[PDB]
Amino acid sequence: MLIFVKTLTGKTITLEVEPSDTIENVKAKIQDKEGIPPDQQRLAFAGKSLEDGRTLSDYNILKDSKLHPLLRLR
C-alpha cells in the first residue's frame, strides 16, 4: 500500500507498507530510503502520534488502495 511521508526538510517520500508493518518497521523503511535514523523519527497521522510498539493496523489508517495517507515527521 502506498503511503507518503513528509520529512522535516519539506521533502515528501513514498513507501510501500501493509497494515501489519510495525511502526518501527516504518521508521526503518524511512531510514533505508532517506537516511534518517529511527531515533530522530517521531511520526504522526492527522495529528495523532504513531508509536513504537504498535502496527499500522492499530491506527485504522489503511483502507483501500486509493487512499494514500500522509504521515508527518515531527
Binding site: 526538510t9 519539506g10 521533502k11 515528501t12 513514498t14 486509493k66 487512499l67 494514500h68 495517507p69 500522509l70
Partner: protein
C-alpha cells in the same frame, strides 16, 4: 528562459510530480528546482512539466483535509494574495486545495508530458 517558471516535477523514475519552480539550468538536461515545500534538488528536464496552472479536467492526486492523498479532477483554480488554489472533485464533491497539496502520479503526469513537458 525556464528560470523562475512554476512547474510540476518529479525526482525519481516512478515518483510523483510535485509543484515548485526552476531556480537554475545546470546543463546535461538537469535543472535546479525549489519545490514549494522547501526541498531543492537537481531534476532531469524530462521529469518537468511546464504547466501552471494545471489545466481543467486533469486527473491529479490531492491531499484532503483528512490527510489522505487520493485522485481527483481539477475543475477550477483561483489566485489569492499570490497563492493558487484548485477546486478539485473527489467522489462527486468539490473542495479547495492549495497548490502545494496537489501532486501527480507517474501516470497522471505522463498524460501531460506531450503538451507541457520541458524540452
Amino acid at each position: 528562459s525556464f528560470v523562475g517558471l512554476r512547474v510540476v516535477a518529479k525526482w525519481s523514475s516512478n515518483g510523483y510530480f510535485y509543484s515548485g519552480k526552476i531556480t537554475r539550468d545546470v546543463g546535461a538536461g538537469k535543472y535546479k528546482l525549489l519545490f514549494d515545500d522547501g526541498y531543492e534538488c537537481d531534476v532531469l528536464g524530462k521529469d518537468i512539466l511546464l504547466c501552471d496552472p494545471i489545466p481543467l479536467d486533469t486527473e491529479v492526486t490531492a491531499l484532503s483535509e483528512d490527510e489522505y492523498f487520493s485522485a481527483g479532477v481539477v475543475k477550477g483554480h483561483r489566485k489569492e494574495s499570490g497563492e493558487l488554489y484548485y477546486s478539485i472533485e473527489k467522489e462527486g464533491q468539490r473542495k479547495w486545495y492549495k497548490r502545494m497539496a496537489v501532486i501527480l502520479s507517474l501516470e497522471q503526469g505522463n498524460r501531460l508530458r506531450e503538451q507541457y513537458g520541458l524540452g
